[PDB]
Design an enzyme around this catalytic site. Structure first.
Site, PDB file in Angstrom:
ATOM      1  N   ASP A   1      65.065  48.003  31.026  1.00 35.88           N
ATOM      2  CA  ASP A   1      64.794  48.499  29.692  1.00 35.88           C
ATOM      3  C   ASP A   1      65.753  47.889  28.672  1.00 35.88           C
ATOM      4  OD1 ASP A   1      63.349  50.237  27.961  1.00 35.88           O
ATOM      5  OD2 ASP A   1      65.117  51.529  27.885  1.00 35.88           O
TER       6      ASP A   1
ATOM      7  N   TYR B   1      65.940  57.027  35.196  1.00 33.26           N
ATOM      8  CA  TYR B   1      64.725  57.106  34.392  1.00 33.26           C
ATOM      9  C   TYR B   1      63.711  58.130  34.918  1.00 33.26           C
ATOM     10  CZ  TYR B   1      63.249  54.164  30.428  1.00 33.26           C
ATOM     11  OH  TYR B   1      62.897  53.689  29.162  1.00 33.26           O
TER      12      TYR B   1
HETATM   13  O1  LIG Z   1      59.066  56.510  27.355  1.00 32.53           O
HETATM   14  C1  LIG Z   1      59.570  56.235  26.241  1.00 32.53           C
HETATM   15  O2  LIG Z   1      59.416  56.937  25.219  1.00 32.53           O
HETATM   16  C2  LIG Z   1      60.402  54.987  26.134  1.00 32.53           C
HETATM   17  C3  LIG Z   1      60.075  54.106  27.334  1.00 32.53           C
HETATM   18  C4  LIG Z   1      60.788  52.784  27.170  1.00 32.53           C
HETATM   19  O3  LIG Z   1      61.787  52.695  26.461  1.00 32.53           O
HETATM   20  C5  LIG Z   1      60.289  51.614  27.891  1.00 32.53           C
HETATM   21  O4  LIG Z   1      60.188  51.700  29.140  1.00 32.53           O
HETATM   22  O5  LIG Z   1      60.002  50.568  27.247  1.00 32.53           O
HETATM   23 MG   LIG Z   2      62.370  50.030  25.833  1.00 33.08          MG
END
Ligand SMILES: O=C(O)CCC(=O)C(=O)O
Ligand SMILES: [Mg+2]
Ligand SMILES: NC(=O)c1ccc[n+]([C@@H]2O[C@H](COP(=O)([O-])OP(=O)(O)OC[C@H]3O[C@@H](n4cnc5c(N)ncnc54)[C@H](OP(=O)(O)O)[C@@H]3O)[C@@H](O)[C@H]2O)c1
Ligand SMILES: NC(=O)c1ccc[n+]([C@@H]2O[C@H](COP(=O)([O-])OP(=O)(O)OC[C@H]3O[C@@H](n4cnc5c(N)ncnc54)[C@H](OP(=O)(O)O)[C@@H]3O)[C@@H](O)[C@H]2O)c1
Ligand SMILES: NC(=O)c1ccc[n+]([C@@H]2O[C@H](COP(=O)(O)O)[C@@H](O)[C@H]2O)c1
Ligand SMILES: NC(=O)c1ccc[n+]([C@@H]2O[C@H](COP(=O)(O)O)[C@@H](O)[C@H]2O)c1
Ligand SMILES: O=C(O)CCC(=O)C(=O)O
Ligand SMILES: [Mg+2]
Lengths: 415, 415
Positions: free
Chosen positions: B306, B159
């Site tokens: 996530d 990430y």
């Molecule tokens: O940063 C994004 O656009 C998605 C982040 C995400 O999916 C989350 O951490 O809930």
């Molecule tokens: Mg998410």
């Protein structure tokens, strides 16, 4: 010195052109598997032999040939031999094979033998159909809505095994190169830090997606969904999505829907419009639960496919009823979605359904569709009879609890 | 030149010691958010103001201060300014803030502003409680069994955004180094290949797990489950598991259960035995559906958290009712689990529940528990009244379909 016995009364399957030539007495290599493999495998043999016997009344028979991987391989060939070269050769030679689950140590120990087989034989397709069998208990209200087929890329991704231990010279070497030579600043704690590599190529993506689309056309399916995390992993997961759509366009005459990026692909045979769409991976995990009917064929990368397979399976009874295949250009190795579940190993307790339905796929793959249909029939009968293994029994009122071997016999009884 | 207006009649929250000093008239920065942010945010403001008014009859009030990120930031500060330095400073300064969802382009474009905020403010905890609200429609049979809390590592993992485009000089540079200097042979297609880096450190792991265990003790929870894929990713995911258990042992006096590796940790207050266990990530996705009651507090890495968040949320009504927080040592930014759902943006259609319940967490965080309880009460009332937004309505017979703003008012009516 070989330890495998080639059956006296069988013949090798061959690959004439791109098509399989399956004789009446095919030799099929099987690996027993670690853990519950000891339970489920004997049961698969019994059930498959029965279906073949009933479908073809003796005209056809499988000459089962045992080959070795994992624990049993060490007991046969000596310690340290977990994956004999023979085994790889035998599967490529005989074209069609089936295995029980294999144990992979967490945090250290040998790398996955499953991944080794997949990578070494270049079985780039992990194919996992998830459908509801009438009468199967389930924690969701409408399991019948789930009828999907997972195409999971099987040769790349973070799954490939390219990684280094925290505090190791190698790890520190890679970190230094990243920091100093690539100007990477986004590593929060560069000390005591494990490192992993996630590769994703265009050739890898397209061969997997090609297969998925072909399957959809050959099976008159409604759509193909590219699942990815391409907003965060732009150049791997997002690349996968881009390549997938590009392929649909360049090789299957895919056309925009509206402003896209969804495509329409016309089925050459049925003339049905197959929708090519995409969904982000986390959202997809809600989507399958909340809007299952909207999904059909799934194409995704190695890690995502792994997560999706288990989540989908759960919707429909869990991974005791989840078959799969690893398929390449030169051979195919069938195996359940589940692993070795060591905590139940030897207890004659687990559901042999998954491995049995993998053999079902194998039979179909062999063009022995009549035998395959007998297995499906037997499964539905046994489940409808509410005579089942622990995993189904615990979600069910008034079911008779059967052992693994017993449920095998139940399936045969309902053929 | 600053474009933010500091409220005349408010006071700054301060952090005396390790504790928050929340005045009666706290200034709370909020970001509207892209997409549906335009709908859900106004509704959160209305509902929060109401709960505070009712709980404290005018004694307390929030001085809302708008700050900018995303599209709106470009319309205010000029193009190209997506994340003004001001914003980062303002959140650190004011300690407590809330945001709508922010759009991240898939396959290219800017990197996630959410990730930017998280990384730049070192909000290493993504905290997502998933519980059932009585009367909520659901596709599972027993949603009431789901009562979990996700602790998701928020600063590392794949990430983090360390990656290179296929066919780019950088990508080729990294590939060459891997192949030639590290002797990596496991890359199947080295040409036209995107590359990503997955870092996982001991310090990152332990600060996240520490928080998870502390939460379990402070809240008298039953267990903490480490979720990981450590059989395949031995040195990242498996490292995470090892460090997590090590931490439990070294800092919380964790003790073996049987032969382990599960631990018992004694709650200093209640004296309850908190179980520390682990589950492999794919298996966990079946586990939550098939054995939800066996799970409580969840500690996992960035990507896994996530995936888990969305899958869990679905069990309990979906991500229109899924709150969360990004929490660091110096400040906290509350936001829903969901994203910008652009396809519904501006339609006054989506569920404001998630962002509302995030404000609920914010209030609790502020020690305004009375206001928070009013929000929960209002939510349960409105849902029990079967007066709801589209996502609930479509899973329900005989419900009145409300717009987003309307459901906001419904919540207030049931306070
Ligand atoms: O940063 C994004 O656009 C998605 C982040 C995400 O999916 C989350 O951490 O809930
Ligand atoms: Mg998410
Ligand atoms: N393709 C493969 O060979 C493969 C795939 C995955 C994992 N593995 C390996 O298996 C080992 C253990 O992995 P794991 O415990 O996370 O996964 P697992 O062996 O699949 O077991 C996880 C859970 O899934 C359920 N389950 C699995 N097989 C079942 C069956 N035949 N019938 C009914 N329920 C079944 C059981 O759930 P409940 O106890 O809740 O009822 C089991 O505890 C690891 O070393 C891993 O590397 C191998
Ligand atoms: N923390 C964040 O800011 C965050 C998190 C995730 C994604 N995003 C961003 O959002 C953009 C779009 O992502 P996405 O479409 O995959 O995810 P999404 O915006 O969360 O939407 C996915 C689906 O979830 C459901 N949903 C989301 N919010 C809802 C609400 N308030 N009420 C009811 N249902 C809701 C809808 O499902 P149905 O249409 O099936 O009813 C929606 O189509 C991306 O650019 C991504 O980067 C941001
Ligand atoms: N056509 C596409 O590329 C695309 C993209 C995203 C969502 N969708 C969905 O498909 C439908 C397309 O319908 P229309 O283009 O006639 O509005 C929409 O309702 C939307 O939910 C389509
Ligand atoms: N104690 C552990 O470390 C551990 C590991 C894996 C599973 N389990 C589960 O916890 C239970 C432990 O019970 P016993 O050690 O008394 O058999 C088992 O039933 C098993 O399902 C425990
Ligand atoms: O290789 C292993 O041990 C697990 C593989 C796996 O989870 C799968 O691909 O189903
Ligand atoms: Mg798996």
């Amino acid at each position: 010195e070989s330890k495998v016995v080639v059956p006296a009364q069988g013949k090798k399957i061959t690959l004439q052109n791109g098509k399989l030539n399956v004789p009446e007495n095919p030799i099929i290599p099987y690996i027993e598997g670690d853990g519950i493999g000891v339970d489920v495998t004997p049961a698969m043999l019994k059930v498959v032999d029965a279906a073949v016997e009933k479908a073809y009344k003796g005209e056809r028979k499988i000459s089962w040939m045992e080959i070795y991987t994992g624990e049993k391989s060490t007991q046969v060939y000596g310690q340290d031999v977990w994956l004999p070269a023979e085994t790889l050769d035998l599967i490529r030679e005989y074209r069609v094979a089936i295995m029980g689950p294999l144990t992979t140590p967490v945090g250290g120990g040998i790398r996955s033998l499953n991944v080794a087989l997949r990578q070494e034989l270049d079985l780039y397709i992990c194919l996992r159909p998830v459908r509801y069998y009438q009468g199967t208990p389930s924690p969701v209200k409408h399991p019948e809505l789930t009828d999907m087929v997972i195409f999971r890329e099987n040769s790349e991704d973070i799954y490939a095994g390219i990684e280094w231990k925290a505090d190791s010279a190698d790890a520190e070497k890679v970190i230094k190169f990243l920091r100093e030579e690539m100007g990477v600043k986004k590593i929060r704690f560069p000390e005591h830090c494990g490192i992993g590599i996630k590769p994703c190529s265009e050739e890898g993506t397209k061969r997997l997606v090609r297969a998925a689309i072909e399957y959809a056309i050959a099976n008159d399916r409604d759509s193909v969904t590219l699942v990815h995390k391409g907003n965060i992993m732009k150049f791997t997961e997002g690349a996968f999505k881009d390549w997938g759509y590009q392929l649909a366009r360049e090789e299957f005459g895919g056309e925009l829907i509206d402003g896209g990026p969804w495509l329409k692909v016309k089925n050459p045979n049925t003339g049905k419009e197959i929708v090519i769409k995409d969904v982000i991976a986390d959202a997809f995990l809600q989507q399958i639960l909340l809007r299952p009917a909207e999904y059909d064929v799934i194409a995704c990368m190695n890690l995502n496919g792994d997560y999706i397979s288990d989540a989908l399976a759960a919707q429909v009874g869990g991974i005791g009823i989840a078959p799969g295949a690893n398929i390449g250009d030169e051979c195919a190795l069938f195996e359940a979605t589940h692993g070795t579940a060591p905590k139940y190993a030897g207890q004659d307790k687990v559901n042999p359904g998954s491995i049995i339905l993998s053999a079902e796929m194998m039979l179909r793959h062999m063009g022995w569709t009549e035998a395959a249909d007998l297995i499906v029939k037997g499964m539905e009968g046994a489940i409808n009879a509410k005579t089942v293994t622990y995993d189904f029994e615990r979600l069910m009122d008034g079911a008779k609890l059967l052992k693994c071997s017993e449920f095998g016999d139940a399936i045969i009884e309902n053929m």
